[PDB]
Amino acid sequence: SNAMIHGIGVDLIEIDRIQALYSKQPKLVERILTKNEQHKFNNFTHEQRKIEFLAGRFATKEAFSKALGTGLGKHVAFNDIDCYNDELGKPKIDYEGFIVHVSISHTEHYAMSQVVLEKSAF
Amino acid sequence: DLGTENLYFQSNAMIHGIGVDLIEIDRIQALYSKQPKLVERILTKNEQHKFNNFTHEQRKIEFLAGRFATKEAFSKALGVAFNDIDCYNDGKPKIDYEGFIVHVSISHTEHYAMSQVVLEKS
Amino acid sequence: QSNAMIHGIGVDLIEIDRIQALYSKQPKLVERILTKNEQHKFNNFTHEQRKIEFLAGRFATKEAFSKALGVAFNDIDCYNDLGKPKIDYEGFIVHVSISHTEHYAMSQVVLEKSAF
């Protein structure tokens, strides 16, 4: 554990899969998003923006899990990873022991997210 | 120290920021075909020279789409006009930006272009 | 050289259909792409769509690694440790991540410089 980066993660998600499931099970939102993220999700005036936000959050959490190492990451509830936005709108995640770097991108049909977990200490 | 909230000043991070961008090539094609002059707002002179010398139209649009994704990913990692961001090739893509070490990678498929950027402070 | 912590990064996005076509047409190319270890996993998949998916992810990983480095594809052994994908290459700490959807596979690689 001499490396300064603990791990990296990336996840690509088809918007139509998220849309399908949200339509088939609206309580999907409560299973992926924190209360804070739900507040945001419910505040979007446009349904397509809601689905994009949800897809981006799902991809981000999957990327975060992959950066941790799936063997550990699968034990972290989505509800416990709060991806919030700073004052410039940049996505952020706080997680003790790391400096978490996140980036999200959207097209009409896909959402993707990248996470790099930098170690906070030597 | 000094009692400032300035994030850059206080930061102990090795990575300054990361950025990813996914672009649908069809959108770039549409944009170019119905507004060719915007290429002057996206590409530097050297990039335009290269853009203009492509013999095949599809490779021309791919180059543009890849540069658009790169400038967006760079912009997101930095936290600067696109036509002042010169992404050149060693054939590795690279961006020189005073004060930083800029790491870039670009990938293309038939329908999508993507780029990722990681910035370290010098 | 440089005082940089990172040597290079790479990303590759690949259309699954293209890999499907490659395997259908020229199944012998797999031995030029996959290491013997990877071929073992590949051969062990009982579901056709999941083995093409595995192949596509490994092709993207080799492409991404190659781009980050700036080595033969079948000499780049990507194995799983907690299930995290890993590649050993002397001089670096190789960070890798792979993602799949129905139609695309992608991989990203960050080559961190080792303070030996």
Residue numbers in the entry:
A (entry chain C): -2 to 119
B (entry chain A): -12 to 66, 73 to 83, 86 to 117
C (entry chain B): -3 to 66, 73 to 83, 85 to 119
Sentences from the paper on this structure:
The active form of ACP is produced by a post-translational modification of a conserved serine residue of apo-ACP by a 4′-phosphopantetheine (P-pant) group transferred from CoA bound to a holo-(acyl-carrier-protein) synthase (AcpS). AcpS belongs to the phosphopantetheine transferase (PPT) family of proteins, binds CoA and its derivatives and requires magnesium for activity. The AcpS trimer binds three CoA molecules and three ACP molecules. The AcpS monomer has an elongated elliptical shape and possesses an α/β fold.
13 residues in molecule A (MOL A), four residues in molecule B (MOL B) and three residues in molecule C (MOL C) of the 24-residue N-terminal purification tag were modeled. The purification tag of MOL A in one trimer docks onto a solvent-exposed hydrophobic patch that is formed by residues of helices α1, α2 and α4 of a symmetry-related molecule C (SYM C). The helical part of the tag is positioned above helix α5 and between helices α2 and α5′ of SYM C, interacting with the side chains of these structural elements. The dipole moment of helix α5′ may have a weak stabilizing effect on the helical portion of the tag. Glu84 and Leu85 of MOL C contribute to the interaction by contacting helix α5′ of SYM C, while both of these amino-acid residues are disordered in chain A. Leu85 is ordered and Glu84 is not observed in the electron density in chain B. The apo-AcpSSA structure reveals that the intact purification tag may interfere with the binding of CoA. This could explain why no suitable crystals were obtained of the CoA-­complexed tagged protein. Cleavage of the tag was inefficient for AcpSSA, possibly owing to inaccessibility of the tobacco etch virus (TEV) cleavage site. Cocrystals of CoA and AcpSSA without the purification tag were also poorly ordered.
